[PDB]
Amino acid sequence: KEYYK
Amino acid sequence: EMEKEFEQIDKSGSWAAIYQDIRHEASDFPCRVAKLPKNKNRNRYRDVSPFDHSRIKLHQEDNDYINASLIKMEEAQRSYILTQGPLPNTCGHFWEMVWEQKSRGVVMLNRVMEKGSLKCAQYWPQKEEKEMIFEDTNLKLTLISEDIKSYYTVRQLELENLTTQETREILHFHYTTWPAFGVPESPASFLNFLFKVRESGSLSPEHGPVVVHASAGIGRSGTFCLADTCLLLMDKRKDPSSVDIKKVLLEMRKFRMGLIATADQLRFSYLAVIEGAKFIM
């Protein structure tokens, strides 16, 4: 649910 | 000129530092509307939001929020709408945005399936005879033709407002082999794709801003727009070698957080502008 890592 | 500046950065290996500097200096603006609880399910990622001041507003009394930003480069005289890969519930919004903003082209830089995960909804019809109807926004979308090449596809779409029965041709430029947080196959592959987008007239000011997206719509999208703007400026200016890529990127990040997501993408944008300059002279 997050773009980064 | 820039090639010399490019030679230097590569030798030191400071790309990660040059990039980390741009990140430190990048603008930070409130994202109140994107973070409203009623909009959680309109955002693909919690760490990627449009700034309140540059966000696109849907012309809908219900809820005007879409995860999309207007990027207005006033010196280069070109605007872009950067947005996320539409969600299954936001495909209607995406095409409403395309209609309301009078966009003529859509540039997609991701794939609908990446690493077994769905990075994006199937927001355009795959077969001429299976058109898409969006009930909520009263829009119909038909695949007219497609031209498939080894690393990109160009599709021709018809967008119709069911209320007015106006129809518009939308061009869909789909770079199909650009991986998340990676780079295109080569500068030449990127430049050929960009030049096809340019030649179609979709970046012309006679239309609304082109829509550019990936999965989040910041990394690959920023690489595409940064290179397109820098090349525009080198044609306009009486001193082409003057253009400073980091200044242009920081100007773009006043409108959307996170544009260009890795040091290698930043490096690749320089390469594309240097290599792309030979065609403009």
Side-chain angles (χ1 to χ4, degrees), chain B residues 98-112 114:
Chain B
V98 164
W99 184 274
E100 289 166 353
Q101 300 307 312
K102 302 178 190 309
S103 317
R104 151 98 165 145
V106 176
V107 173
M108 159 165 195
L109 304 177
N110 72 303
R111 206 129 118 242
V112 173
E114 296 180 340

Side-chain angles (χ1 to χ4, degrees), chain A residues 4, chain B residues 19 22 71 82 217-219 221-223 249 252-253 255-261 265:
Chain A
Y4 287 112
Chain B
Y19 179 62
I22 282 151
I71 305 202
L82 277 66
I218 68 188
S221 324
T223 311
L249 178 54
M252 291 200 328
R253 290 204 173 205
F255 302 94
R256 187 162 172 87
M257 56 169 66
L259 305 187
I260 298 207
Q265 285 177 1

Side-chain angles (χ1 to χ4, degrees), chain A residues 1-4, chain B residues 45-47 181 216:
Chain A
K1 232 290 191 169
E2 315 173 302
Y3 189 63
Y4 287 112
Chain B
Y45 302 112
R46 71 169 51 86
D47 50 342
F181 305 96

Side-chain angles (χ1 to χ4, degrees), chain B residues 209-226:
Chain B
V210 62
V211 176
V212 185
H213 79 78
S215 177
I218 68 188
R220 290 165 285 189
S221 324
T223 311
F224 175 89
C225 295
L226 182 56

Side-chain angles (χ1 to χ4, degrees), chain B residues 75-93:
Chain B
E75 186 190 350
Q77 289 214 273
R78 177 157 289 169
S79 310
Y80 318 89
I81 296 177
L82 277 66
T83 185
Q84 66 183 17
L87 293 155
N89 49 309
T90 66
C91 290
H93 308 147

Side-chain angles (χ1 to χ4, degrees), chain B residues 41 69 79 114 134 141 157 172 179 192 203 207 230 256 259 262:
Chain B
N41 73 5
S69 312
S79 310
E114 296 180 340
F134 302 95
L141 178 59
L157 308 164
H172 195 249
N192 184 67
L203 300 174
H207 308 115
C230 290
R256 187 162 172 87
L259 305 187
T262 79

